[PDB]
């Protein structure tokens, strides 16, 4: 919804995200999937450099991603690691919404 919240939801300083803990918090409410980006925040903000009006933008480089994907047991997850580009909505030169993996 905004860059402060995007960071909390989508930027990780570990590839080994503690899915079963974090996905259960009020930030996610045990939803099916969330993509975490293993990166410092500056390179991630910089995806949106010079993009002011709301626009979906695909990363120029691949990143290390960790997906928490729900198992058959509600709020219990598998961590799926991938290396890929991803797309975000840029508003006011910052990511405010995670669009998808691989493309916009």
Q: 34 among the known binding-site residues?
A: yes
The answer on whether 49 is annotated among ligand-binding residues is: no
| CATH number of the domain bearing residue 76 | 3.10.130.10
Which token pair is 10?
Answer: 């989508």
State both tokens at 36. Answer: 């975490």
97 flagged as catalytic: yes
Domain count, the chain: 1
Catalytic residue (one of 3, 10, 36, 68): 10
Tell me: is residue 67 an annotated ligand-binding position. Answer: no
Query: DSSP secondary-structure letter at 1?
Result: -
Catalytic residue among 93, 97, 99, 101: 97
Q: Give just the sign of the alpha carbon dihedral 76, 5, 41, 54.
A: positive
Asked if 29 is an active-site residue, the reply is no
What is the structure's resolution, reported in angstroms to one decimal? 1.9
For residue 23, give the DSSP letter. T
Pair 76, 70: CB distance under 8 Å: yes
**Beta carbons of 15 and 66 less than 8 angstroms apart:** yes
For residues 94 and 78, what is the distance between their CA atoms, to the nearest angstrom? 29
Alpha helices in 1-104, H assignment, sequence order: 3-10, 19-22, 41-45
Query: Are the C-beta atoms of residues 29 and 65 closer than 8 Å to each other?
Result: no
Query: Which domain range does residue 81 map to?
Result: 2-104
């Amino acid at each position: 919804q905004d860059w402060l919240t995007f960071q909390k939801k989508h930027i990780t300083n570990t590839r080994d995200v503690d899915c079963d803990n974090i996905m259960s918090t009020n930030l996610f409410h045990c939803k099916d999937k969330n993509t975490f980006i293993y990166s410092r925040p500056e390179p991630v903000k910089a995806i949106c450099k010079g993009i002011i009006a709301s626009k979906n933008v695909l990363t120029t480089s691949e990143f290390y991603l960790s997906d928490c994907n729900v198992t058959s047991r509600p709020c219990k997850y598998k961590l799926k690691k991938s290396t890929n580009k991803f797309c975000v909505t840029c508003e006011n030169q910052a990511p405010v919404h995670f669009v998808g993996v691989g493309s916009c």
